[PDB]
């Protein structure tokens, strides 16, 4: 059992070490990842973050012994389109949280290196889930622009209703526009209005 508390001594130290090493490995590629995850050049024209349209082709569901349901494609929107102020970077997704732990014989050494490898691939699976999450979000926004080009989703309908000078004698606001999103983006089920892309 002393091997086991040596292993959990090694686990959080290996996780914090791998978190630090991939933090400066992420910081080495910071302009490259800013070029990769250009969310700023994917927002809509009234500063709307576009929604995340997941795609699944070739879907089957065996409900019981007697009935299946197949569909050829499904498209599901998660994370619906909304007024963003500042567009998201990679660092809200991918930054692993670095603390440096100050919490400290032969089986201690070999189980602490086994725990160090467990902390290293545990932090690697945290990273694998993080680039999985940002690949999901950026691929869904790319797929929103694809299906808007294919006329499968509606664009969002803002309404800037204007107010002029607004308020009493103690507060004025001079050009007071209030902007709403009335229509959220949604998939149209009208099948005949779609666009089918050729190439050459």
């Amino acid at each position: 059992a002393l091997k086991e508390t040596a292993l959990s001594v090694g686990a959080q130290a290996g996780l914090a070490w791998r978190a630090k090493i991939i933090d400066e490995q992420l910081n080495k590629q910071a302009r490259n990842l800013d070029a990769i995850y250009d969310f700023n050049s994917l927002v809509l024209e009234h500063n709307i973050l576009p929604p995340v349209l997941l795609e699944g082709r070739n879907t089957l569901n065996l409900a019981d012994a007697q009935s299946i349901r197949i569909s050829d494609r499904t498209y599901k929107v998660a994370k619906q389109a909304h007024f963003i102020t500042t567009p998201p970077t990679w660092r809200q997704y991918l930054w692993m949280d670095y603390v440096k732990p100050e919490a400290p014989k032969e089986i201690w050494c070999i189980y602490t290196e086994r725990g160090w490898k467990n902390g290293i691939d545990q932090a690697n699976t945290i990273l694998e889930e993080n680039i999985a999450r940002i690949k999901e979000d950026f691929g869904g926004m790319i797929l929103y622009r694809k299906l808007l080009a294919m006329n499968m989703v509606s664009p969002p309908y803002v309404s800037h209703t204007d107010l002029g000078v607004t308020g009493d004698g103690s507060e004025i606001h001079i050009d007071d526009r209030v902007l709403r999103i009335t229509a959220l983006p949604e998939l149209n089920v009208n099948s005949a209005e779609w666009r089918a892309a050729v190439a050459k």
Binding site: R31, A35, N40, S41, E45, R145, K146, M150, A197, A199
Partner: protein, 106 residues
């Protein structure tokens, strides 16, 4: 990019609104990720062009991030003009010396 460029053909470029010029064929190599105004003012200040803006600035900042190496200022401002899609627009009047940045009306 394939499905968007085949469902709408891009009929026009922006070289007819940003033409090349003498002291616009000076070259630059830019990494930049802030707002558009300091970048375009520095491009025009080293281009020896008077920089002016049209439109008041939006309250969300229009952000670009130009990361490229060794090209002239005309295609740098064309990349700035493309990266500011429907938010701002770079025009260059090379009969005078004006680099002008226009925001949008929303």
């Amino acid at each position: 990019a394939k499905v968007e460029k085949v469902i709408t053909p891009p009929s026009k470029d922006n070289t007819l609104t940003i033409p090349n010029a003498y002291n616009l064929q000076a070259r630059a190599s830019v990494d930049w990720s802030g707002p558009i105004e300091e970048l375009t003012a520095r491009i025009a200040k080293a281009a020896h062009f008077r920089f002016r803006v049209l439109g008041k600035s939006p309250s969300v900042p229009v952000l670009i991030s130009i990361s490229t190496k060794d090209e002239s200022l005309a295609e740098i401002l064309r990349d700035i003009d493309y990266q500011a899609g429907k938010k701002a627009s770079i025009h260059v009047y090379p009969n005078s010396q004006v680099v002008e940045l226009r925001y949008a009306k929303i």
